[PDB]
């Protein structure tokens, strides 16, 4: 038995996403391509976020992604900052940004 994820070449599940879509009260019937396409987009977004988080973690000389790393990765990218416009990340801290006026004048 070959799963639909294997045929589509995605890491994210296709059967589980299809079941969630069909048992989630979105439409009467749900096409076979919608689940695959949505799984592909979800996998792409997760890959982007994890790549940026890994870069941030390597910048701090660590080999484990923490919520702080994810906050740093998300808030240092325009597209992901727009996607995370109103989302709080637990235990993620804030970007280091001191205003120019507060800086020592001389």
């Amino acid at each position: 038995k070959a799963s639909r994820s294997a045929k589509a070449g995605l890491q994210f599940p296709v059967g589980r996403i299809h079941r969630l879509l069909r048992k989630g009260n979105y439409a009467v019937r749900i096409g076979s391509g919608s689940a695959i396409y949505l799984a592909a987009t979800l996998e792409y977004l997760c890959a982007e976020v994890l790549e940026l988080a890994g870069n941030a973690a390597r910048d701090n000389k660590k080999l484990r992604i923490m919520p702080r790393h994810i906050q740093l990765a998300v808030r240092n990218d325009d597209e992901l900052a727009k996607l995370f416009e109103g989302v709080t990340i637990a235990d993620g801290g804030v970007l280091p940004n001191i205003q120019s006026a507060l800086l020592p004048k001389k």
Binding site: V94, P96, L102
Partner: protein, 99 residues
């Protein structure tokens, strides 16, 4: 004469020290008591899970820091560095929290 830092540099040092950690800034027990007395007014004798109070603390800390960023922007706008309650009121009234 004991060493005494100029007024202001300690503030910048602790600003740099606190924008680097992810700890919880409000003490856990006082926040839990505040949450419990506030919830007491809506349903008598409510039980809070050990994670609901933590989630409330994280959300409130994020909200207050986000409000203080805009308060700082407003204070700098008026050619100041000190934040005063009018700055907080303006920052809240621009973004839409009527009170």
């Amino acid at each position: 004469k004991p060493h005494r830092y100029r007024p202001g540099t300690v503030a910048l040092r602790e600003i740099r020290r606190y924008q680097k950690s992810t700890e919880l800034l409000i003490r856990k027990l006082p926040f839990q008591r505040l949450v419990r007395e506030i919830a007491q007014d809506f349903k008598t004798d409510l039980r809070f899970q050990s994670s609901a109070v933590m989630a409330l603390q994280e959300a409130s800390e994020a909200y207050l820091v986000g409000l203080f960023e805009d308060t700082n922007l407003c204070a700098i706008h008026a050619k100041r560095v000190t934040i005063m309650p009018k700055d907080i009121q303006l920052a809240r009234r621009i973004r839409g929290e009527r009170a």
